[PDB]
Amino acid sequence: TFRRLWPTIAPFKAGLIVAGVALILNAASDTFMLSLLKPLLDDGFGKTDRSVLVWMPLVVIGLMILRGITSYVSSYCISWVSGKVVMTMRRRLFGHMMGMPVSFFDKQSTGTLLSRITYDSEQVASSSSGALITVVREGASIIGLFIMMFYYSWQLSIILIVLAPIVSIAIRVVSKRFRNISKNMQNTMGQVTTSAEQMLKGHKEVLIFGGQEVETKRFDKVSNRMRLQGMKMVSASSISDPIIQLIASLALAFVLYAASFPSVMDSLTAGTITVVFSSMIALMRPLKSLTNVNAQFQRGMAACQTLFTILDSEQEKDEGKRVIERATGDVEFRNVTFTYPGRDVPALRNINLKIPAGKTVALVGRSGSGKSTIASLITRFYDIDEGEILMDGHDLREYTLASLRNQVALVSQNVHLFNDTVANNIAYARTEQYSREQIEEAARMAYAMDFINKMDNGLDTVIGENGVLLSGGQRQRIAIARALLRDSPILILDEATSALDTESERAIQAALDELQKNRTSLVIAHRLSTIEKADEIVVVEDGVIVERGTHNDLLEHRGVYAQLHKMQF
Template structure:
């Protein structure tokens, strides 16, 4: 299971865990702390001047003090301004560094999470964790820290001054200190609970907005504006209610603390009326002590108010740590291989998706000799794509074993295993980059421009790339749907749901391999994918930017870019999961020819609904409800006149004589 654990740490434990992230920047904290203490010391010093003014100047003992006291006051104000600037700058610098460090750590950890984790978490919630929650941490580590240190130093300085002038009156305030501390502690618990609810609700708001933005065409087509507006209104109202609870708790805590403090002040004035106390007080002393007590109200109120902000930050830290504590994808293999021969074997493999009771695969046995092609057919949900996910170890099997060249997949390191495979799947991610960079992803320095264009050409992608203003360098937009697979160093993804990154065509083809693929290699891959036919018609060719998620490309054009990316990998194992499903008949024939060339001397697993695309497979497996019910060549299965033959007859009897 990869569900995130519920945060149970206290605020102190949470901050203790956050400290290693803050400690590398402690020099900034030290400078800020010194500046804050200097800033806080101004108030007690000003009250000392007030006492001297009343006792000495007004008492005519040192009337000359009036000559230099204005200069001292101006100097103190200047010191306060400079120290305030230094503390504010240093604290903001530290908080910015902390937030950047947390975000990078969180992002890196998410990239190491298994596919099952992303199946259980909405994209909107995870985006909220990276953006909103990290900003809450920034508030806790900047504004809250400034307030705590400055106001804490102010309270300490005022108490020291008060005890120096009248320990009897000051002692009264210490008696009430535990009451104030208890009130703040009780309020803190409510703040933290509300803050956690606000973060969860913000994740829902982000998730609903994301779903509407991604499915806006369906919303418009099916008239779902009212439904989506109501849904978003409900979660937005939940966020508003949580916000009002926070405001209510804050508004209640402020007068509560002030009420407790007012009782203390009243009692101090009453105690000062006792003859035994009055004989120890001068007018200046009483004014200074009483003024200090009044000045304590401001830092006490600030500490109470900042408590809500601090608790929001700590609650945000807890949600971030919950993700960081979630186990990453296991990579316990030690075997590293340069290039596999490609012999694949499934031996009595069974698998059930997490949270499901029905097995997706049951006792599957398949042997694919190196260089051979095996096709999987069957209804949607029969388990065909699950086999591809198990082969790439997006999921681990429950029982049995999967072998590559006689070794269990779990014996290989994940990087080495996925280096051997090019996955052409139903869920393709192309990056927010150019076409060329997507084709040569992560190997751009190895593949030339020509290689990228050749890959695009072979995938019939150049037909549309050439029509674009910037060709392969067209930006194709960003897409929040990409999974761990699309981030894998070794994977190429091509599907009927193509995901292109907001970058140039060349960068999409060379995705994650820009440093390994030369420009010529990228162009060659585009050419082989039949992509150069449209890329050459674009003004910037492979350097054409193609918009968010390839919005400037048609479905078939996007798919050819993804196929070019797979062609560029030159992996010994090829997985084709509905690779040509989004293409018209003409493009499919052209790409089918390119894919047949690509399949030569490669072990190929084809998952298809169109039986016309798998007739040349060495073996065809018909899967129903996670089991292999028929197997053989195309002709053998037709002669058996079983389920495959009926499926074949149904497809071709319904085929339209008109071009697609």
């Protein structure tokens, strides 16, 4: 169907070929083991030659060991191709899902985003190879059990294969008739049960009118009808299996009857009949399983078109060629409006903010609708709807995306830590650029050296989850170390502290003060300490900025900043 997945398997087609050559072999070994019933019943028990019961245990063991060997080889050489194509699909989804915009990550899919690399990305192969196994095994077993029947007895096999369509259609017709009859009877039972429910509903009226004897008399007939319809349903459902079994036995009796005549048959001597009929019994499983090949292959290709919709999708629009090395200027918002994708209500209205060089601006206002939003826009996590965000006499869209992200340091208490050494986390994405001495210096001046020396191995301890666990404050200080080592000229201090641990703030505030040397920062104002010492204070109210003055003058005018002090104090 959606066979753009075949090039993923083309580099490894030597496990599919081997698991077709050693699975056709498994089917042939099944049908050869089933062929032993004729030598057994003819030249073994039936005859006086005990030798056939001496080598037949050995052949049975040597064919079951061959079945096991070719069923483990057929499992390893498809679990190696259905494992490596899955590996390639997973690491190809984790090269397009790690570049595309945050909007897909925002609320389109959060928990299922890992499902689309764990469950669906393994289902695409556990169903496609599960269908290849079925088709190439039950197309070998079915051919083997056809060749066996037509080799031992074409006379009986022809009349046994002519009847199989006849028996199948007769059983299907009978089952359809009784399914329709049972469906009608179940509809009638549903109506009667609805009547019983309606009898039950009027309890408060039955009590007040005193109709307990009349209501139970009326239900003595409703329940009697429930019984007489239930036994009708059972009689119509349990008369189906006997009739279809009777039709199957009519066919079996006719096959036996055909064998009576000498012209048609009687070349069979007590092992040929047992092999043919045992194969026909064993021929039902590799038709019942074979019919589901297309259903399983389509169920394993819907879960590939899903992965292609995740993959063959919009990436991050890197429509930029201008390269900036250091934000030696001012990052300015000017009449820009933005709304979250997937929602219509503007989370951010027209904005006009100035971030002067060598100075910091505080995003005050605990409304919760406008503070976190503007923080994202500087790094182009969510692209603006229309307007302009300016960064050193340019626009963010103009600048290269890679050259923009490295200019900004998102400092927050809730900061991700990678499953790696802390020396790698502090120099994440820049391990080659920054030497160990630089990391030591950064941790020293970021006040994070106290925690790391306490750790077991020190700077090389695994810090992420599934390892050592560090409290919110340690994560904050590691973020300060990252930002200060990277020397990002722009800082977006979320300051989502949400706690005041003893001596944690005493070091965090000092580290932030040391960080904010001349680094122009758009601080999210959660702590009044930074608000008091701020070059400019700007507030947001449902995306609208109204009070923009400094912390002193904006206190005199009531507006929202004094009201924030009223709300804060």
